[PDB]
Design an enzyme around this catalytic site. Structure first.
Site, PDB file in Angstrom:
ATOM      1  N   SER A   1       4.494  51.573  39.844  1.00  0.00           N
ATOM      2  CA  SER A   1       3.161  52.100  39.979  1.00  0.00           C
ATOM      3  C   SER A   1       2.406  50.977  40.675  1.00  0.00           C
ATOM      4  O   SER A   1       2.818  49.834  40.601  1.00  0.00           O
ATOM      5  CB  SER A   1       2.567  52.386  38.626  1.00  0.00           C
ATOM      6  OG  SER A   1       3.342  53.345  37.946  1.00  0.00           O
ATOM      7  N   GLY A   2       1.327  51.285  41.356  1.00  0.00           N
ATOM      8  CA  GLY A   2       0.581  50.260  42.023  1.00  0.00           C
ATOM      9  C   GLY A   2      -0.863  50.579  41.826  1.00  0.00           C
ATOM     10  O   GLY A   2      -1.231  51.145  40.836  1.00  0.00           O
TER      11      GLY A   2
ATOM     12  N   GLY B   1      -1.627  55.381  41.724  1.00  0.00           N
ATOM     13  CA  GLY B   1      -0.612  56.303  42.181  1.00  0.00           C
ATOM     14  C   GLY B   1       0.734  55.779  41.746  1.00  0.00           C
ATOM     15  O   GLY B   1       0.861  54.655  41.241  1.00  0.00           O
TER      16      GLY B   1
ATOM     17  N   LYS C   1       5.028  56.996  47.849  1.00  0.00           N
ATOM     18  CA  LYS C   1       3.838  56.910  47.020  1.00  0.00           C
ATOM     19  C   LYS C   1       3.278  58.303  46.759  1.00  0.00           C
ATOM     20  O   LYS C   1       3.103  59.095  47.690  1.00  0.00           O
ATOM     21  CB  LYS C   1       2.796  56.016  47.683  1.00  0.00           C
ATOM     22  CG  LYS C   1       1.736  55.530  46.748  1.00  0.00           C
ATOM     23  CD  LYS C   1       1.204  54.219  47.259  1.00  0.00           C
ATOM     24  CE  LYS C   1       0.123  53.716  46.369  1.00  0.00           C
ATOM     25  NZ  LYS C   1      -0.414  52.376  46.748  1.00  0.00           N
TER      26      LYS C   1
ATOM     27  N   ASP D   1      -6.451  42.169  46.132  1.00  0.00           N
ATOM     28  CA  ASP D   1      -5.509  42.284  45.026  1.00  0.00           C
ATOM     29  C   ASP D   1      -4.300  41.401  45.315  1.00  0.00           C
ATOM     30  O   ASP D   1      -3.142  41.817  45.190  1.00  0.00           O
ATOM     31  CB  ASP D   1      -5.125  43.741  44.758  1.00  0.00           C
ATOM     32  CG  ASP D   1      -4.435  43.931  43.398  1.00  0.00           C
ATOM     33  OD1 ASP D   1      -4.678  43.119  42.468  1.00  0.00           O
ATOM     34  OD2 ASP D   1      -3.678  44.922  43.256  1.00  0.00           O
TER      35      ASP D   1
END
Lengths: 300, 299
Positions: free
Chosen positions: B16-17, B20, B37, B127
């Site tokens: 997971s990122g 999504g 994704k 990030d």
């Protein structure tokens, strides 16, 4: 390049099973994708070697993944497996955590047979859960595989079929959400427990969740005792309210097996099949996927 | 068979990122493994289309993964990427959460350059963390990729290079363990903050953990405030004790950049390059690997 056995390119981490981490590997020779389990060589209680021998014993079986390579490499014992498709948990999420009745029944029939095959080879799985079933690939895409023998144990002697002894005052080994009540009560696991766990798995497919999941406990470990109490204070007829009675009959049958009873797998399959026909379902291998909230944890 | 775009076989979930999921895919035509994704169309705060749009802007870039297909199928929007190798967090664990200095410097040099490429395309990543750096495959196996643009944002106008305006009282977007201190203070992110985060990543590779990691807080509003309080109360000279001064020099330089300053990436790289040279490491690109609970922000 980073390899295991100088044969498999190591890819990203794709999971973390019973005892070890699992990464995606690429067979350099064939190009086929593989799964690569790693376990640190000083894990206090090593297990990858024992798991690999269990896998080797099951090799002929329908829905048993092929083990490609075992060995030791640096800080790790290595087990390379055939890569399969998505897990049943994966497909469940994909379909927005709702399976139709037909997909549940199609799955039930194969999962019962998988557990019976393991039992026929003298082993109990003890970690039956959506994550530990994967679909096959391409032409095997309609085949349910069972994986992860890291918690598996011999339940009977291969020669004499003497059953392991009854025992109490055990701690839980597997996943709290799907453990049998007798496991909650500390009793040694046997064949009935794999099947009773399946029963909770199937009700988990029907419902989207189970009533003891996401129990709003802050402190952990006491979280375990609260699952057990909800599980024990929820009758199977209440758990299964709104669904064909066969799901409650299945669970009552599993709870009624004695410690060393041989399950009647043929019965449990028939209990579902018959309902399958009554729905007018065809065995056409068409599953659902062919067409704040709850954050529960399997290890707490 | 279940396919996406009538082209890609769906595999298991590999993570997971940003916001999504992603499951291993297989291009039916070529057989090449891909990353897929997925984002539910019934999302109120969607980004996959915006993320995929950033990816299309970056396509030529060194260490930028290729988008193969992007589209909608059933209840999901879809982005198919080139599958890359393990993440730097994955390799770190593999090497038992110990990187040599030479591997840190190898990683530092490429990582500065990745961030500079993104900045040169008028974007900030916001990030920066080990999980969002992956090594390439085979012939590109020594190449560090940067991934996941779900939190990326334009920091300067594409035509005029006017910097976006200064702002306060923002909420934390990324991962608390690596956020710049100014992000903790609620200040709009800019180029300095990507690089400051990198500095924390580098010291994290050197140390095995950061002193604000695994802080034993029960609530949650609290645990982030204790990360923020620990991060701010640890002087950089204490964070970097026992390691070449370049790691403190890099971090002090990042903390000193003004909101809209253009970082001197060439200097930050040279600082590590000169350290590499004095160590007498061979220039061979050989990395180490070739020889209700606590939430810390997983998203």
């Amino acid at each position: 390049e980073l390899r295991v056995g100088n044969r498999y390119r190591l890819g990203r981490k794709i999971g973390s099973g019973s005892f070890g981490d699992i990464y995606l590997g690429t067979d350099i020779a064939a190009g086929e994708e593989v799964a690569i389990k790693l376990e640190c060589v000083k894990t206090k209680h090593p297990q990858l070697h024992i798991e690999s021998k269990i896998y080797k014993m099951m090799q002929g079986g329908v829905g048993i993944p092929t083990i490609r390579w075992c060995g030791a490499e640096g800080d790790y014992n290595v087990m390379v497996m055939e890569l399969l498709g998505p897990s049943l948990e994966d497909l469940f999420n994909f379909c927005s955590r709702k399976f139709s009745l037909k997909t549940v029944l199609l799955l039930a029939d194969q999962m019962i047979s998988r557990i019976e095959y393991i039992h026929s080879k003298n082993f109990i799985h003890r970690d039956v859960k959506p994550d530990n079933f994967l679909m096959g690939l391409g032409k095997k895409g309609n085949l349910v595989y069972i994986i992860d023998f890291g918690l598996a144990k011999k339940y009977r002697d291969a020669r004499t079929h003497q059953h392991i002894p009854y025992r109490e005052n055990k701690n839980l080994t597997g996943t709290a959400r799907y453990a049998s009540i007798n496991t909650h009560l500390g009793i040694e696991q046997s064949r009935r427990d794999d099947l009773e766990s399946l029963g909770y798995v199937l009700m988990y497919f029907n419902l989207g969740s189970l009533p003891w999941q996401g129990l709003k406990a802050a402190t952990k470990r006491q979280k375990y005792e609260r699952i057990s109490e909800k599980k024990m204070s929820t009758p199977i007829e209440v758990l299964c309210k709104g669904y064909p009675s066969e799901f409650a009959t299945y669970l009552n049958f599993c709870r009624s097996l004695r410690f060393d009873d041989k399950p009647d797998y043929s019965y449990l399959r028939q209990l579902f099949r018959n309902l399958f026909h009554r729905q007018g379902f065809s065995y056409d291998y068409v599953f659902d996927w062919n067409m704040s909230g709850l954050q529960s944890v399997v290890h707490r």
